[PDB]
Amino acid sequence: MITDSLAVVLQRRDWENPGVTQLNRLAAHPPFASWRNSEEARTDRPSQQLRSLNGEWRFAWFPAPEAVPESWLECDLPEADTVVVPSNWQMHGYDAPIYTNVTYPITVNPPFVPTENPTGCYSLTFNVDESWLQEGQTRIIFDGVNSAFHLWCNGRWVGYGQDSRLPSEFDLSAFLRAGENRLAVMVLRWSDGSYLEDQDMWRMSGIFRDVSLLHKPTTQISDFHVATRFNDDFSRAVLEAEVQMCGELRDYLRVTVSLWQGETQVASGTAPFGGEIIDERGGYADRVTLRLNVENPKLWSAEIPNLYRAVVELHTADGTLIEAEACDVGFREVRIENGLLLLNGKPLLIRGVNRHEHHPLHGQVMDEQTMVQDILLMKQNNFNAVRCSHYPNHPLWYTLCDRYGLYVVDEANIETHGMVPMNRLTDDPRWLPAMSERVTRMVQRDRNHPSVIIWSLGNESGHGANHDALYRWIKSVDPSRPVQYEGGGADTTATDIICPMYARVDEDQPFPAVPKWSIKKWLSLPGETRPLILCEYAHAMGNSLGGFAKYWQAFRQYPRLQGGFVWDWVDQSLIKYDENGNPWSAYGGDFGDTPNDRQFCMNGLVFADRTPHPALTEAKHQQQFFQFRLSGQTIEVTSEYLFRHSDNELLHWMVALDGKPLASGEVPLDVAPQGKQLIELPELPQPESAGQLWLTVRVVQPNATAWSEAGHISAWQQWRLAENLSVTLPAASHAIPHLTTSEMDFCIELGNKRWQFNRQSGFLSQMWIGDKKQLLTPLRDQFTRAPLDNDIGVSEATRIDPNAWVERWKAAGHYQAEAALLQCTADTLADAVLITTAHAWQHQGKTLFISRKTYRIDGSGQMAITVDVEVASDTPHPARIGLNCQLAQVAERVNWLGLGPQENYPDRLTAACFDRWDLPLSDMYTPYVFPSENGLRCGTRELNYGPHQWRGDFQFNISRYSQQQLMETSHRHLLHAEEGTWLNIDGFHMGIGGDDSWSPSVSAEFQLSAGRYHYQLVWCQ
Amino acid sequence: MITDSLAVVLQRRDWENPGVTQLNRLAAHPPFASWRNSEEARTDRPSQQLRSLNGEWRFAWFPAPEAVPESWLECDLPEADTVVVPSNWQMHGYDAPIYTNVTYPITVNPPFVPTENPTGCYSLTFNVDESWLQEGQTRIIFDGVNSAFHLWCNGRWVGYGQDSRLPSEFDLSAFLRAGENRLAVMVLRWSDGSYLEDQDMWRMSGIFRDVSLLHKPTTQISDFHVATRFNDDFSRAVLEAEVQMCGELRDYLRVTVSLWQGETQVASGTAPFGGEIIDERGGYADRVTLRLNVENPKLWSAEIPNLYRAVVELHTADGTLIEAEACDVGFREVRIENGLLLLNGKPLLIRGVNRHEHHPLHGQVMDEQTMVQDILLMKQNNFNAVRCSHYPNHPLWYTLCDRYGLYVVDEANIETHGMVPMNRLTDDPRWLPAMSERVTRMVQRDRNHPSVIIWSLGNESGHGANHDALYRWIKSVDPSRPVQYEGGGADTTATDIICPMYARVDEDQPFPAVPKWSIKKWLSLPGETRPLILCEYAHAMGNSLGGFAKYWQAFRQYPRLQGGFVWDWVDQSLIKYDENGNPWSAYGGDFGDTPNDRQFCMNGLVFADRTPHPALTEAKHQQQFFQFRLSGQTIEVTSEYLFRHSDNELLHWMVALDGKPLASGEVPLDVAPQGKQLIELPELPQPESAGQLWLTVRVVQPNATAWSEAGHISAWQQWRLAENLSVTLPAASHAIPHLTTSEMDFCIELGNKRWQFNRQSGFLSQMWIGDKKQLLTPLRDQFTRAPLDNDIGVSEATRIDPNAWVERWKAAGHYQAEAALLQCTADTLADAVLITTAHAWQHQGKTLFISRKTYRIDGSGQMAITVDVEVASDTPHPARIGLNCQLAQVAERVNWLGLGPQENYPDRLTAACFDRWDLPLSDMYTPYVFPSENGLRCGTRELNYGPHQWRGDFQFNISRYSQQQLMETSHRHLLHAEEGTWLNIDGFHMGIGGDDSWSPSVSAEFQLSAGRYHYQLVWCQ
Ligand SMILES: [Mg+2]
Ligand SMILES: [Mg+2]
Ligand code: NA
Ligand code: NA
Ligand code: NA
Ligand code: NA
């Protein structure tokens, strides 16, 4: 037929028209399986009426839709390959994925898209049983197609669809034939729907979610809604189920809804069709509402995800079953009352994270195994909520969240971040239909899931009248869930919750017309009463999450600060192979994509392979459900659970003196929700030996759960007990170090040890143990670090951001400053040799820093170093103040007394505990995909590496990579281990920040602004 | 091109798809003229850039779209006729118009329409000047096409459109050629848009509004909005004008907005493009907002429609004009505060009427002359508001309302009355795009008109979530106007005003789920605070508007009862010609249309030719802006104007004794808005003669206005002054009437007069003056009337409504009751002859009525009749209790002392005044298109017709048509004058009702429920 040809179908250019978002697409609805057996529906066994078309398909790539030959509609192309479906065709190397943050990947000219529009032609040959075509309705379901597509069946045009993130269904009953059938799908990379899909993520395309065939009878269940109502104390519930049908109504038709708790039927109801009168013309003859009473229902929550099974039966009066549908039911009430978000009558505290659907190998194709891995990792790290940023997810995600227990914010697939202004489309009534489809079809698909507690209207689209209209539509159709939206300043008329992104705890950010007030100040603005839940905060880009504890202190102090969603869960890195088949993680620009936003795609708490970043432990500690207070010998344990008793918790305490255990014990936890338990410790040891006594408590779950193993640690806390200062005089050795003075250097010898101080540079240049040199590079002051992602921000060589810390440091000359020797003197004491040095670091005639040191080598072989540094008040505050050297030794393990075991920084050390830690050298380096300063351990009093030992009170990192190499290397796989080991010992280190990664975010109390600094070290063997 | 062919264009069947409401249609906007001269824009002179295509077109009718030959796209069909455009093709006899009230004219199966879909093919050959195609944009504008259409230009497909009531615009720049061009428009009668167009009106089709070409420059004004803000006392105003452009932005571009009051420029402003920052991405570079201060602005209102002229200039910095646009500006503020609708700080009282766009000859094609005639008639009858029921009107209507002064409710073209339930579509998200287009494009077109004070979401579509969404969209885009909607019970979340239809003053109507509470009770329902303005009330079907005074008493007593809109203005009758070219008014079913709703299309206050019905005077009197109170000799005049002083009003008073004037005078009116004026009358005459003194006042406008002639009467009132009862004995004549008794009759003779009473029937059978018989039918009791439309309701022979008054009367046998003579006796008195009669009216053995009479013929020739009637308490209350006869006389004039001059009934007589009235016999018959009881005059003490005179206290009507003929005749043109004159003299008459015309609406105080009745008459010559 001419009308089925490509020349006719493509002529209207439906993908450059916001007025046409679909053609011949069926209505949205909750998940259906069309069970013909009620027991199978109840037990959720696979349905023979639902058939997966996933598997091997034929695929051909074209640069534009006009390049597809007409013969593709009739037979498979000879050049076509065989590919796995679902998939993204960028993951098969057909064209490159594009990573851009805010700028659209195409020329901004709505609704038009470039003529060179990459086109993917999918096709499948499949058989259909004759029973399916004898009677009933056969539909095909595309769970997701990016970004738009035309559909042919046996050469006849079927329909068109947009909104890559929601299912598209088409009736194939009039197109299918008995035996062999062929499906032809033409997928377009760009469409007018792409203007509503400007999320900060990789831009891919293809049939990236499941494809299936569903067979329904002619008389069928077409929609069903489940609602729960409760009394004041939640002891009585009414389960209201509205069922809708299509087909011929007959007086013998009946609907039965039965509720099951496991194997036991709790409630049931049967009724003929015909609803109550609603207006002058009557009621719905094709609908019925059944109300089931449930006594003492088991309530659903993230703490205890109690679920019931509701089965909806369509049957005749005699008793023969026509069709069955089922869904999991969670009894829970969500509402905002007096400014607080309540779940089952109790105020929530959202321990949330944003999660994109990302896999380093399969792109944006999701699988049950990855979903379960993510959910278990989140729950094991004290997360209780997830934001579907920024689109409806794969349908199995909501089922798994129902089952395991996580609150879900379901978000419409609308983001127009790149528009200027941001609301240019969302304030235009001509785009209201397209926006409305994306909201309404999501609600229609997901409104039955108990895990979904909040709807979101999208992300970063400004504030337009369409937002207000769709907010009100949701409030009318589903009053059971609050609606939130951040655009337009996060407190507009289109949101029930103040939901800002990256608003800071105490600091105001008064931007024009969309200020980000401090969250504490925001609550008290005149006339403001809503709760505040950050939809994004604590931007976890690289070495980040500095200041997380401040957020959680505020969340616990202020009732209307009910938490937030960290940005974000997993790095969006992709895997590439070099010349040796070795994989390496890639970010923006690594696929030839341009313009790109480089490493801003990696903001996760876990790597793309789901291994954790160090910041995850900080998040876990701050988000823990047990809070602790110490008063003398008693421990006060406060529970932050709202519904469950501590029936799987054992408290273990340990007392150690500078790392060596002295006493320990175990006490079972029995604390009610939001209750307290006082734990009286026995008479703790009081050693007369010098050192600090430390008490450490940890909560252990003795029994495995659905989401954790036996012995899982869920919370911990540490305190300092009594301290005994050391007043013992050092052992007076009889040997005296010998000083030899040449015009080049001072040489100090004691036994087999030797120290050399270069007199022209003023630094310790070499150290000998026997005849073995210990240093590859002299011991020198260091004031800089390889810049973090938070240090760099949005700055780059093309667009310099002068406010970024790295740019201020570079302009001030911190990285190029040259040390000028001021003095270097050697003196012999009664029992030691004293070296005094002074240096000035200068850049273009300006003295940035002055370092004055004293080296005291005594008869015991120990070298005591005192450092006093002055920092010019008008230079930017330095990243660190310390020493560094390249040791010749390469040892296998690192042992230290201090905060650990994981890397920690001054504004990100609350999760770390003081103890004796011993790790392999490799664990002392954090392999961030974008290399930077990493692996620091703070609060360290002793460090052991090979024969060397350093003592004092310092921060350190130790690795095979110099700060220079880390700074100059753009990818972690390009790093090479240098000879020996680089040691950085810092008296002082600046915070890492992380409130956001595009502006300075290190709070004042963690900047090195004091002007004068002092620290001491003891180096011995 | 194959893609331009009918076979390809019609294949997608865009008219059976709610997802496609247009293709390639330009954005909506306020009216544009693209003036290239600012003085021409200011003076509103015709623009050479706007060209009307109205005139002679070629037209061909087809039964279905598939019947149109392909050659129509290239050349005009040989069989095509030449027709005038705009027009409705049913008005040219191509197919029949259909009148149905609620039932859809097609099978209800959305979105599908019948295959036999009448199709009208329009075409026009026109020239285009080469200057228009050298540069700029040329667009075609279809102001209205019913109901959907495809457009071709020079054989190339252009686009598609729906929503018959709003303009559709298409860019023809790439399709036009120099010289001869051809336009081809295929209009379809039915589409999926028809499901949203179920208004109670004739169903027509075609290009029924103007068609024009507009030429714009490439850089152009694309939209402009005008908003007025005020201080607390309205003495300072800020005129805010937002201007939007399309085309290439250049730094030299400027926009100037100037405000003019007649010939004087009041304010001006100039600015380059670029708006303020609105969100993170910036502001609109293609928009500018200019704020002009106006001191002491002249405010707009229906009382004083002060208007300014705003001119919007697009020009370069040097000063050359690119384009100009203009609109009339009315400074006024509309808001609801504390439950009251306020205009310029004062609470409105809406004297409204619903108005369809209807013409008896041109169907639904409107013209300026008819619009002006309607506006003048409305204002002359004390109306101040109009509801555009139920769709956006022709654009000139809003301009005329701005100019003359009338508040306007602008209503979206959405009515789904026939759906079951009524919200089946409006609660479906799949119809949200189609509904949103109809709301948003109306707002975009009309938001600048000062006369529009309220938006309406449509009519009778139930209540669905789409209503709430669109309500909120309007509230977001245009906060300056309240939003109202009646569906779903008239007090839903989608309306700012309680706006019920046909809610009664005191009586509750508690329907399930959508009750119509009495309006007084509705205001005080727990938690209700909004104002109440009936969107429809006082259904004026035929002889109706009984009980109107009750509504207006309530409106004046209750502050939150702020009026309503009468249903409706003009009868929707159409003109047909019989076998002699004589026109006659036709209603539903007269065109072969079936099923139809007969005479329910005629509900107007005026006939289709705009001649008034009698009820219009009642409305005018009740709605008058001056209220009166009498206390002794002083008249208290209260002004109901809110803004204007009574600077064009003179009060005339007159005192009459039983119709003859005794004193009169004139007093100028000087009363402030909402003020009072006491008028002291001189020492009024005190005649000793018998009779009732009546005081009549009338307010006269000495000076002509824009809407009225000099001497126009705007208000009036009457009171009874002192009465002197007659105690004079009658003149004792010496002649004695002579009684002759035969077995057939009693014969009374006095001089040349003779009376005959038939002794077998018991009635006066004949009367002689000389040798001339005076009666054609005997004088007999009458208890029935030819049923009114309010008596009939929805009852018909196929579907009997047992509750209707006519059905109750028929079932009780009132129309078939047979009089049985009980007694008939003649006695001779000292100076008179006495006749005593008694009758019983029985039906199937039940005595319905008993009448006992006394006839006393004295020596003066007068016949005194006393009547005493008993009505069975269990029979339905009769329509009247009186006498009737057929006089042989046909006299030219009727003279009576009583209420007049126009027809009046017991519940519709407040406008009538007691006086001596003299009219031709023809004026005593009201020619309702559907014949019924008509022409009654109440409160009559004397009636003169030919030689006869009747005296007493009675109601009467007199005409050439019997009640039987009126009852049995369905159209007024089928009535024939009977021989002689039919007289109905009633002691008592039932009210006519009219709160609605589909249920009994006559209030209890106007039903004849007393059980016993007495009245007396004196018949003399
Ligand atoms: Mg489109
Ligand atoms: Mg359509
Ligand atoms: Na809180
Ligand atoms: Na990012
Ligand atoms: Na009132
Ligand atoms: Na009607």
Swiss-Prot record, chains A, B:
Substrate binds at residues 101, 200, 460, 536-539, 603, 998. Gene3D superfamilies: 2.70.98.10, Galactose-binding domain-like, Glycosidases, Immunoglobulins. Its EC number is 3.2.1.23. GO terms for molecular function: alkali metal ion binding; beta-galactosidase activity; carbohydrate binding; identical protein binding; magnesium ion binding. Changing residue 390 to E/F/K: Essentially inactive unless very rapid purification. Causes very large destabilizations of the transition state. Na(+) binds at residues 200, 600, 603. Its cofactor is Mg(2+); Mn(2+); Na(+). Mg(2+) 2 binds at residue 596. InterPro entries: B-gal_small/dom_5, Bact_Beta-galactosidase, Beta-gal/glucu_dom_sf, Gal_mutarotase_sf_dom, Galactose-bd-like_sf, GH-type_carb-bd, Glyco_hydro_2, Glyco_hydro_2_AS. SMART domains: Bgal_small_N (SM01038). PROSITE patterns: GLYCOSYL_HYDROL_F2_1, GLYCOSYL_HYDROL_F2_2. NCBIfam families: PRK09525.1 (NF007074). This is Beta-galactosidase. The lineage of its organism: Bacteria, Pseudomonadati, Pseudomonadota, Gammaproteobacteria, Enterobacterales.
